[PDB]
Structure formats: structure tokens, C-alpha cells
Amino acid sequence: TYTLVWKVWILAVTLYYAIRIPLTLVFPSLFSPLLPLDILASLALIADIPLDLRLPDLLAALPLDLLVFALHLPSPLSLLSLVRLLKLISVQASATRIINPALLRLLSLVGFILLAAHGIACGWMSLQPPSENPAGTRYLSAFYWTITTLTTIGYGDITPSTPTQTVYTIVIELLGAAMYGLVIGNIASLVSKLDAAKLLHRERVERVTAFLSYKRISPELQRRIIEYFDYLWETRRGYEEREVLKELPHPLRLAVAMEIHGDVIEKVPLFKGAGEEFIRDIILHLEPVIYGPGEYIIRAGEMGSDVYFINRGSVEVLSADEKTRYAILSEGQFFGEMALILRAPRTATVRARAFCDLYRLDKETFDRILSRYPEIAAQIQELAVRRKE
Amino acid sequence: TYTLVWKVWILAVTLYYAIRIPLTLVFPSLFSPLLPLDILASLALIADIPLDLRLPDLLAALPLDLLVFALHLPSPLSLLSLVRLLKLISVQASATRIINPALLRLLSLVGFILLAAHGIACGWMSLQPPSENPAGTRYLSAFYWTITTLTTIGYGDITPSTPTQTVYTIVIELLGAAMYGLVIGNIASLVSKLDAAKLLHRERVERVTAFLSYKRISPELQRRIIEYFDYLWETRRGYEEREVLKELPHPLRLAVAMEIHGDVIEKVPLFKGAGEEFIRDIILHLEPVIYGPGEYIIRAGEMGSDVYFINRGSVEVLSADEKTRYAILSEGQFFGEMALILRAPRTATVRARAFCDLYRLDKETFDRILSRYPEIAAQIQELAVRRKE
Amino acid sequence: TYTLVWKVWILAVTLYYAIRIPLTLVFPSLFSPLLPLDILASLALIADIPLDLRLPDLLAALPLDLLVFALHLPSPLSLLSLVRLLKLISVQASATRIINPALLRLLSLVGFILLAAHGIACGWMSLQPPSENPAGTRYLSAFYWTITTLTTIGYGDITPSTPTQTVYTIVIELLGAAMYGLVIGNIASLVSKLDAAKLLHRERVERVTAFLSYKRISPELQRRIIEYFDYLWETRRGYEEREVLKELPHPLRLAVAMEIHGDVIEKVPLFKGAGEEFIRDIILHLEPVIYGPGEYIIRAGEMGSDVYFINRGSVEVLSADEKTRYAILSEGQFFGEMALILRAPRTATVRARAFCDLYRLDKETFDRILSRYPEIAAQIQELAVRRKE
Amino acid sequence: TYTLVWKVWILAVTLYYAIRIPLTLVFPSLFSPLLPLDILASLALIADIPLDLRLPDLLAALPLDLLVFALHLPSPLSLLSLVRLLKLISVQASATRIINPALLRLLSLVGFILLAAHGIACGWMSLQPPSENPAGTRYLSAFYWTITTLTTIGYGDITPSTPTQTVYTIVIELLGAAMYGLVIGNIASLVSKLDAAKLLHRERVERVTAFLSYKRISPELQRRIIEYFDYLWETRRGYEEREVLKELPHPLRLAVAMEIHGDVIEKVPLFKGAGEEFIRDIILHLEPVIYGPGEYIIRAGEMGSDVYFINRGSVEVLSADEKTRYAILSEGQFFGEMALILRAPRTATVRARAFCDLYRLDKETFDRILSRYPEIAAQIQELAVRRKE
Numbered sequence A, B, C, D: 001t002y003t004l005v006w007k008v009w010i011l012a013v014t015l016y017y018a019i020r021i022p023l024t025l026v027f028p029s030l031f032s033p034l035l036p037l038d039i040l041a042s043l044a045l046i047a048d049i050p051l052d053l054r055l056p057d058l059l060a061a062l063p064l065d066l067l068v069f070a071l072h073l074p075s076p077l078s079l080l081s082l083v084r085l086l087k088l089i090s091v092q093a094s095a096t097r098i099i100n101p102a103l104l105r106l107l108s109l110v111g112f113i114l115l116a117a118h119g120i121a122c123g124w125m126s127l128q129p130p131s132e133n134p135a136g137t138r139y140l141s142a143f144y145w146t147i148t149t150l151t152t153i154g155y156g157d158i159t160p161s162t163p164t165q166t167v168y169t170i171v172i173e174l175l176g177a178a179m180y181g182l183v184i185g186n187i188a189s190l191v192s193k194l195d196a197a198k199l200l201h202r203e204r205v206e207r208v209t210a211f212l213s214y215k216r217i218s219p220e221l222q223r224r225i226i227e228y229f230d231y232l233w234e235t236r237r238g239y240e241e242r243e244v245l246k247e248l249p250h251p252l253r254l255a256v257a258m259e260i261h262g263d264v265i266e267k268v269p270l271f272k273g274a275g276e277e278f279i280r281d282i283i284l285h286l287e288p289v290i291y292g293p294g295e296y297i298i299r300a301g302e303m304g305s306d307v308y309f310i311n312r313g314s315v316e317v318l319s320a321d322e323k324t325r326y327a328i329l330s331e332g333q334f335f336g337e338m339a340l341i342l343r344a345p346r347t348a349t350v351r352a353r354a355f356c357d358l359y360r361l362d363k364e365t366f367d368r369i370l371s372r373y374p375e376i377a378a379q380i381q382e383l384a385v386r387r388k389e
């Protein structure tokens, strides 16, 4: 690729102007060594209108720079040489078309502060009287004053002394010390905006835990829920698969679900090779669910028939009481299907042996796909009639 | 119109007082040239009670001004000449009856700051001792002090030196440096309140995109959803037509829907000339929906019959497989209607060729309008029986 | 009543202590004239335990004050004479049991600031060296310093000069300049918390108005919705009668609805004298609804029968077209009832003549009360069969 | 237990380093007495990798400390002796695995401020010139400067005077005066996050009370709702048993409900000894409900049959009118069950005598458990047929 390099070179050039132009405006001793670099940048400035596949980018290309510096034009006209800074408000969104978007918006709001402070400090040095000082010390004092004023510290060791400096200080205090607070608050808001899934899950578990304690609850149950919440966060990161997909259209939701539940399909024997249209029919009706250890799922005698497709874990299916346990199931298997095949209530208790994660499909869709597909119905029928001993 | 000019002249006059009255209170050298202007303004002040088609506007008309300045009355009585400023809290809502309301509330909260700062600076100059200084410099120093104090910079180069100045400074610090923060925070809140549709759509797409990546998703699908979101924002601006109309009453919602869906009616042949009562019956049951390119809509054999009225785009209707594609449809046409006419499942696959935007009406309302209207039912019946080849 | 006076006297006494005790701690010249007042207050302090129909009120009664001041006890023991300030954190909720609760919480958060600032200023004067200054000037300077430090202005004209003053300044900066910001933010939040109904209705109408304009809408309809919203705010203040009553229990909701809809009952002839149990049955099923001028309600031929009990306004019932309009209805009347009496569709169009406010009861409850009550059913039957001409 | 002591010793050691290391870096006169303590701490630092039942804890164990201080290595290499502070960002979550989580997060955000301020003050003393001053005064001045700068007071009595001190001050102002605001705002947010149930109930009752007054409501009803809200808060603390349990899985919700409703089971005669499976069936279908004094529940003649299991309070069952009241019921009893036993409407009015709290089970589940269990059905049948006189 080459857009990723071109839009980085453009950023490095529009920052080069943003740093160099005011420093040349205050120090006329420059522009002698830095002319080839400036023209090499400007030819790239005019080399972007053809590569457009709005108006601020048009203003930036015209070279008012190279003219004011060459003709030592008077200060009021020359101050308008800042038109090349208009690419800054046209690139921060053009360079956004490329990591976390929130992270790019924290780095962008810093560079803006460090450029505005440099501009204000450079403007402040221009209004001071002519003194025989090194450029480094004179710039350091101006930057120190600008950081003191913007942060609203106000040491007062150096202060304006002339009416024009007083007016400049008033303007900077009025509309520079308030915008800094806005940018700092935005930086705080979008550094808090990071990893919001953790900040949501933590708030949820705190809200649950507060109530589980006003009503005093046995520690053997109080610690059993924290384990489940830790497991849910540790296997799912607090994300929920329903509210995220609520806004996507049904074909796009179908395409996403074809990717997320890519593990349970083609794992159980009767999903791989079952076709394409059946899996497309059923992929939107399976819910994740998590069952803890020693935690019953089927109680051997109630109504209803929900089938549990095991994704990971193991169950310990038993009769009414223990009495020589029937068998054990593992990953890539399912149970609880013959309650609807034989139109009979549950015949055996099922309890998990570890933190099982498994997918449940309701009775309604199951009977629909029994009445809709013959091979699947025949397979479940023969498996149910065979598993009777 | 003339209200739009009168309520601007009134604003320009009530700002004229807000600027002139304290400056005349501190400098008695005025009131000599500015008497005809003040009486010309005051006659407009008393020319608004008849044009009332509450109490602060009544206080403002009485001319306490013109009296205190003429009679050089002592300072305690004269300070109460500020009653003409009471029109400010009666006009900012009267001038609101006229652009973005949020924008008018950002401009209003600025002028308030620039008027309060001027008032505080003017009050500060009055308490200083009698010195032979130009009025401009003495006002500039006072305004510099006021901006320093309100912004909470606190340079300290000029400070109160008398007990009365100390009390004034204490009052300004207590109830002027905190209100400024409130107004600045309000300005920030209602400049963030602007273009909230973009700030909602961006948050929604960021929330979706965060989860589509913890579960690693193929780039060919990861980039396919961003395209759909960009198209939705680019054709709809993130607005949703359901929550906005949830609060409007049913006749007003009907009237609005008569305007929003003004393109699909009188475009398809059987909506123009179909009457008024039928269109009024159906206009609230069509949903927008967006289908991407190469994205199937009908899969040729499932149950149900939802009719898709094409608004813009084109479909590529096919049989079970390709095998000499049937035909092609374009704007101002509809399909998927003969599944309910013949009480038969779908007979042909339909897939979009571009980013199609089209309106879907459910089976229930369709069968209702078939059983309710004879001409429409006959037209759909003959069209369905004709389109069989 | 006498609680309203006693709990005001108690406030005036616990503020008397909060102002007097530190001022006596720093100036020992007091306690000579102000002894009878202090004992008169203290006897009321001990006169509240019997009037208890928790522990801070017990600490406050014991008179550590009257002892430290009398015995000129050394400074470390005497500083613990501030136990009488513990009534402040026991009264602000006891005096709350009495206007807007939010307003009482804005006044309370001010007095707290003005008491904390006074305490900090009084503490600061005690640490300064012995100088021959008037008490007023010495207190004014201390209060000026405290307001400068708390507000984070930091003029720096007067600063700590000794290690103990440095430690005191560090403590005040650390835990006094941050709490002030918290209290100011709370004051802002609960002055914004006032009149929240207007702030909700304004936000709702702004949200609606933003979308009605991206889709360009005729001015004759764009101004017709603003009129309806203005009328709704002007007759209802933006309150909704459903979400407010969602949390009240059904008997309390019934009792409230017996009061809110006190105008439509005993206005229409067949509600007054209809009993008590019938009105109690129907009072929870009538909804307010607002219809604009020239805005149809019934379209003469559709299905369904909803009865509209007119509360205020007038309707202009017509046939299919105008053709010598049938009649006119006014307040305390109802229409649209014979559609269910004769099991026939609507026979006449109804349109409002002004901004009508009226109550609608659905068909289900209507047929229920027809099948449940004979006199009401007979009255509606004879009225419907009579109104046919 | 011993983890609770070990993870406190580790905290006390990692704070010992955080306080001692910079103070030794600036004052080389130390490290002579404090060597055995440092090695005793370091042996515990290396005694935690075996007790791991990530990478910052590995960096901390290696003893760069003990080396730089012993070898008086030059300042640039020695500044990297701060690696032992990396345990701070590994313990604040390890010590979290142990009171209110929000409270632990307010104490943690304080200690962080007091450690950062100490570090910045210690760094500031190192850059000052060599002066004959006591260590205490030199540290006090540095801490005073750091608190002044971080809080953004800016007294200006002591300011940087060298370019390196200017650069240090610029860095501290830029990234130390903004982080302090973030931490203070977080402290405010999570001290407001405390006791959120009260802050929710107060907001709810304020929202209800605002509307009950625009529509003027009789004081005898206006004060009757405040009593109910006070009773609900005073017996329930504003918590709701439905939204809290919405996220728990059905077995965990069942286990929690087995604990919360531990008072009504085994209180009424026919719940204790009724088994285990019946109580497990019914425990999720009983709702709390609160009825006020003199507040009717059953009106003797309507349809439906909801049974009210009395938990606390007493009812005053009456006939159509008073006429020698039937009887009185108390705790551990139920009524309103023979409306479904005999398929007849209600026969007697019921009204509470005090603030009754009782559990209601709907008709559907009741008839289900009648048709599902014979002993319970027989008991209710014989009790209903016996209670007829």
C-alpha cells in the first residue's frame, strides 16, 4: 500500500509548517537555509488535488508562504501567511481514514495543545522590546509564560508591561485559558472512554454485590456468584451478543453470526454436512449460556424440551437419584432432545461437572425444524430411540 | 415583515444602555453629547407596551436614567439608575422567538460574559483614588484586572489596597469567579450539544466496531460493515424515523409521514391515482430498509410474503441457481407480491446489484388491503398471474 | 403550629454558636458581655432531648463551652470546645422535615461555604504574630486571604512566612481548595436540577425540530407542530401522567386519579349520579389527548369505536362531505359511541374547531361496562337510537 | 488466614520503598542506618514469585536498589533505581482481592496523590543549588511549592530561576496540574457513587412529588404518599428485587430467592413440610407488596382470585358493609383463596389495619399448582369449604 505512507508524509509536512512558519515570522534570520525544504514540501502541497480519490485544502496549496518571507513584506500583510495551517483542520479527519479511534483522538488532542502553546509563545515573543538575548532563552521564557497562563497557575514573576501586551494577555486569558480546560476535559473523557467493557462489567458486578449483602447471604453462596462473574468476564470480556447486533440489518446479522458461532457448527456430527440452508435457518436461534459446577440443568420430570448443545465442559447425567449413573457426555455432543421426540417428560437429571459453556435452542424452533427437514428429524428420532437403556 | 427588525433594534438599544450607563456613571464628562441618542432610545423603550402582541419590561420603561445624570444626584441614589438593564432579562427570550436554538444560546452566553466583565471593570475603576490618567489607560487596567480575577489567573501585579477595595475584591472573587466557570461549562456543554446526530452515529459505530474485533472477524467482512454504516450515515445522517415521531400525535405523525415519504408515492404506477384514503391507510406501515450489493433478499422457497417497494437501486432476480436469469427490476417497481396472491412459497431468488434503499410492507397489512380494496387487489392479481413465464 | 418556630430558633442558635465560638477562641476579650446569651442558648440546647418526637445531638448538649472560656484553659484542650458545631450536621436534616427541596439544598450549600471560610480565616488569624492592629482590619485581611486561597486565585500579596503557617497553608490548599470545587459543582448541578420539566420539554422539542428540517418540510406544516408543542407546554407544563404514576401502588394511583380527573367526572350528565363503583372502575382508563384546529378525528366509515369525552373545545361533526352539517358539540359532551351500539362503522366525520383537549376510552373497556352495568348501557342505547336523523 | 496479613505486609513494604527511595536519592547521608531494613524488605520482594497462587512484579524483585546506593553510581544511571515502585501498579489490584470496593478506590486515589506530591517535591529539591539549610526546612519549602503548583494556586513567592528548573516547572505544570484534576474529579465521582440507593430513592420521590403539586392535591392525600414512601425506604432501602436479579442465571436466581424469602416459607403451616419441589416451584412467583392503613385490597364481588400471603401486619375482613365483622387475620396466614376454589366472585371486603407487607401469587400459578399437587389442593379445598359461616 501507499496511501498509508502518503498520508503520513502529508502529516509530517503540515506539522513542519505548523512549527516553522511562526518561528520564521518572529526570526527573520531563517528562510536562508530552509528554502529548499519549504519548496520540496510545497510541491507536495500542490500534489494532492489530483489525488482527491474541501475548501481548506484549496486555500493551503497556494504559496502565500515563499512570498511574504522573500519580500520582507510589512507585518500586517505578512501575518496572513498562516494559510498553510488550514491543512491541519483538513488532515486530522483525512488521516482518521486509517488501532483504536479513541486512542487516535487522545493523541490528536495533545499535539493540538503543544502546537497552540507554541503559537501563543511565539506570538508573545514578537511583542517584547529589542533586547540582546539568545534565541533559546527568549523562546524558553515565552513558553514558560504561555504554559503558566494557559494552565491558570499565574506565578506573576513575568507580566505584561505595555498596553498592547496587556491587550494580548487579556485575549489569551479570555479565549486561551478556557479552551485549554475544554481540551483537558475531553482528554479525560476519552481516556475514560477506553476499555468501556471493563468499566461496564465492573459497575454491573458492583451493583449486584451491593444488594447481595444488605440481605445477609451465606459466604458459600456469596463467593459462588463472584466465581461465576469472574468466569463470565474471563471468557467473554463482558460483551453481550444481542445489543451489539440489534442495529445491524438481518442479512448482516446473519453474516456476523455465521462467523461468531463458527465453533459449534462443524463440531457436532449432524451440523457438518447438514447442508447450508438448515444451518442458516438455525444459526440465529442458539443462545450462549453458562452453567457452573455441580449445578443442575434438567430435573427429570418437568414439562418442556430445550436442547443443550455442549460447546465446552462436561455433564454428569443421573437418574432420579444417583443409583449407578447412566453415562457421561463431553464436547461436541447434545442432550435433552428425546423429551420432545417421545412427547414425554424428562427421564434423567443432568448436572455439570465444571464451568460448562453451551448453546440452547428452544422447543419451538426444534419442532419447526423437525417438521421442516426429514434427514435431521430421522437422525434425531433414531438417536433418541437408540439411547434407551 | 417588521417584527424581525423591531426586535433587533430593541436588542441594539438594550445593549446600548448596558454599555453606556455604567460608563456614564463613572465618567460624568459624558451625558453632554449623548442626550439626544438616549432620549431617542427611551422613546422606543416606552413604545413597546402597546406592542405587547412581564414586570421587568415595565420597570425598564420608566426613565430613572435622564434624571440621575441630569441632577448629579448623590452616588447611593444614582447607583439605582441600572433599572434599564432589566430589559436584558426580558429580551433574550423575546428575541428567542425567531438558525439553531443551541447556536443562539452560545452567542447569548458570550455577550453576557463580555457585559459582566465590562460592568465589573467599570465598578472597579470607580473605587480607585483620583489620579491624572487618560480614560483609555485607566479602563484598560481595570479590564485587565477583571479578566485576571474572573479567569482565576491571579497575576497579582495590581491588587486591592484599601478596605473597601478589599471587600469589593472579596465579593468579586466569591460570586464572580464561580459564575464564570458555570457559564464556561454551559458554553462547552452546548457547543458539544451541536450536531448531536453525528456524535450519536459515531458512538454507535464505535460500539459495534469494538466488539466485531475481540472476536476476530475476516477483513472481507470487517470492511463490509463499515461500508454499510458509511452509506447509512451518508444517506440518512444517523436520524431514525421512529423515535422522533414517537411523541407526535397520530394525526400529526400522519401529516409528517405524508411529507417524508413523498417520493415513493406517485412514483410507482398504482399509488398515484389510487385515491387518498388508501395511501393514507398505507403510508404509516412502510419501513425504510437498506440492502447491500450482492446481498440476497428472497431465497426461493421459504414461508411468508413481504413486498419490497423499490425506491432506489436495482435487483437481479434469479431462479434456484443462475440458469438464464429471469429479468431485472429498477426504481419505481415492486416484487415479492405473488407469494401471497397464489398462497405459494417463494419461486425465485432476489439479490441486489448495488446499495438498494427500499420500503417493505408486512404481509398482514397487505392481506388487509387486499380484502379491503377491490381495484388494488384486482391489479395485483392480474399482475401476478401475468408475470408467470 | 410550634415545630416550625422551634426548629427555626434551633437553627438560629446553632448558627450563633458556629459564628461566635471561633471568634471567642481567637479574641479572649469577648465572653464578658455574651455570657447570658450563651447560657440562654445552652438551656435550649439541653431542652431538645425530651423533644425527640442521633449521637451528634447528644455530644452538642454537654457544655464544654462556658468551661474553656471561663477557665482560660490552655490552647490544646480548648481547641476541643468546637463540639457545639456538631449540631450543624444534625439539624440540616432535622430542618429538612418542613418550598422546593432542591432550593433548600442550594441555600444550605451556601451557608456551609460562608461558615467554612469564616472558620478558616479565624484559624489563620490565630497563627499570625502579636501586632497592634484593629480587630476589623485583621479579620478582613484573614478573610481576604481565605477567599483568595479557596477560590484558587492566588494573588500572592500576603503569604505564609513561618513553618507552622506553611503547614497550615498546605493543609488548606490540599483539603480546602478541592472541597470548595465540589460544593460549587453541587450548587451548579442543583440549580440546573430546578424546573427540570421545562429542561425536558425544551430538549424534546429541539430533538423533534432538528429532524423535521434535514428532510425539508413545508413551512405551513413546520409552524403547525410548534403551535401544538407550545399549546401542550402551556396547558400541561410538559408533565406526563403515566411515568409519574408508574411507581405508586394501585390504590394510591386510584386515589390520585380520583383527584386529577376531577373535572370531567360530575361534568358530563351520566357520570354524576352514576354511583361510586362505576366511576372507580373507569377513572383509570381515560387518556388525555389533544387535537388541533381543523384536524379530523373520525373519518366516517372505518372500523372500531373509541368514545371521545370532550373536556374543553368544540367539534364540527360533518357527513361524508359538508352538505348541511349535522350539528355542533361543546364541553361536557361525548361522541363516537353509536359505532359499537349498532355494530356499524362510522357514519359521520368529526373535526375540531379549536385546540380541543378531550379524554378517550377504548372499545374494550366500553363494551365491558356495557355488559357490566344496565343503567349506563340503557342510557347509551337510548341516546344512540334517539340521535339518528 | 494468612493472605490477609501477607498482602498487608507487602503493601507496607511497597509504600516503604515509595517513601524511602527518592529521599535516599536526594540525601546520600542515608543508606547507612537503613540497610538492614531494606534487605529485610527485599527478601520479601523475592519471596512472592513462589507465592503466585504479571511482568511488573518480575521487574520489582531484581535489586537495582542496594546497588546504586552502595556504588554511589552517577546520577543518570542511578535515576533508574525507581524500578521498585513498579510493585505499586501490581499491588493495588492484588490487594483489591479482599468493606466497600468504592471506599477502597477513594482511599487508593488519596495515597496516590500524597505519593506523587512527595515525589515531585523531592525531585524539585534536587535541582536547587547547594545551600546550608536544614533538611526539614528544605523539604517543607519543596512540598509547599509542589502543593501550590499542582493545585493551580500559583502564589509565585518562590519560582524557578534556571533553565533546567524552568523546564522541570513546565513539565510539572503540563502533566501534573492536569492529572491532579482528573484524580480529584474521580474522588468526587466515587464519593458520590457511595450509597447510591438513597440517591436513587430520593430522586424518585422528588420526581413524584414535583408532579403531585402542579395539579393541586389535597394535603390529606399529599401527606399520605410521603408516609408510604418513607415506609418503603425504611423497610426496603429503595432496593428492588427484580432488576438486581435480572442478570443472574435461573439456578443462581433460584438459590438467591431461596435465601431472600426465608421468612414466609416455614412460617405459614402449609409451606413447612410441603416438600422441597413445591416450594422450589413457587418461590419465584410471589411478589412483595405493601398496603397502607385503612386501604382496601378486596372489594367483595369482582372477578379474579389473587391470594395474599400475609408476611407482617393485620387485615380487617368485612362484608359488603360493616355489619358485625367476620374475623381478623394476622401474620403467617393467607386469604383470598376460595374465589378460585368455588369458581365464585369475592364474598367479603378486606382492608388493612396497619402498614401491611405481604406476598401475592397470581391466579395462573395457583391453578397450576392445584392441578399439579394433590395434598396442597386438598388442604386448600377443605380449608375453603370449612371457612364458610
Ligand SMILES: Nc1ncnc2c1ncn2[C@@H]1O[C@@H]2COP(=O)(O)O[C@H]2[C@H]1O
Binding pocket: A298, A305, A317, A326, A327, A328, A334, A335, A336, A337, A338, A339, A340, A345, A346, A347, A348, A349, A350, A387, A388, A389
Ligand atoms: N443412557 C444414556 N446415555 C446418554 N445420555 C442419556 C442416557 N439416558 C438419557 N440421556 C440423556 O439425558 C437426557 C435427560 O432428559 P431428556 O429425557 O430430555 O433426554 C435425555 C438424553 O438426552
Ligand SMILES: Nc1ncnc2c1ncn2[C@@H]1O[C@@H]2COP(=O)(O)O[C@H]2[C@H]1O
Binding pocket: B298, B305, B317, B326, B327, B328, B334, B335, B336, B337, B338, B339, B340, B345, B346, B347, B348, B349, B350, B387, B388, B389
Ligand atoms: N419473470 C419475472 N420477471 C420479473 N419478476 C419476477 C419474474 N418471476 C418472478 N418475479 C418476481 O420475483 C419474486 C420472487 O418471489 P415471489 O414469488 O414472492 O414474487 C416474485 C416476483 O415478484
Ligand SMILES: Nc1ncnc2c1ncn2[C@@H]1O[C@@H]2COP(=O)(O)O[C@H]2[C@H]1O
Binding pocket: C298, C305, C317, C326, C327, C328, C334, C335, C336, C337, C338, C339, C340, C345, C346, C347, C348, C349, C350, C387, C388, C389
Ligand atoms: N345528528 C347528530 N347530532 C349530533 N351528533 C351526531 C349526529 N349524528 C352523528 N353524531 C355523532 O357523530 C359520531 C360519528 O361517529 P359515530 O357513528 O361513531 O357516532 C356519531 C355520533 O356520536
Ligand SMILES: Nc1ncnc2c1ncn2[C@@H]1O[C@@H]2COP(=O)(O)O[C@H]2[C@H]1O
Binding pocket: D298, D305, D317, D326, D327, D328, D334, D335, D336, D337, D338, D339, D340, D345, D346, D347, D348, D349, D350, D387, D388, D389
Ligand atoms: N369467616 C371468615 N373468617 C376468616 N376469613 C374469611 C371469612 N370469610 C371470608 N374470609 C376470607 O376473606 C376472603 C374474601 O375474598 P375470597 O372470597 O376470595 O376469600 C375470602 C377468605 O379468604
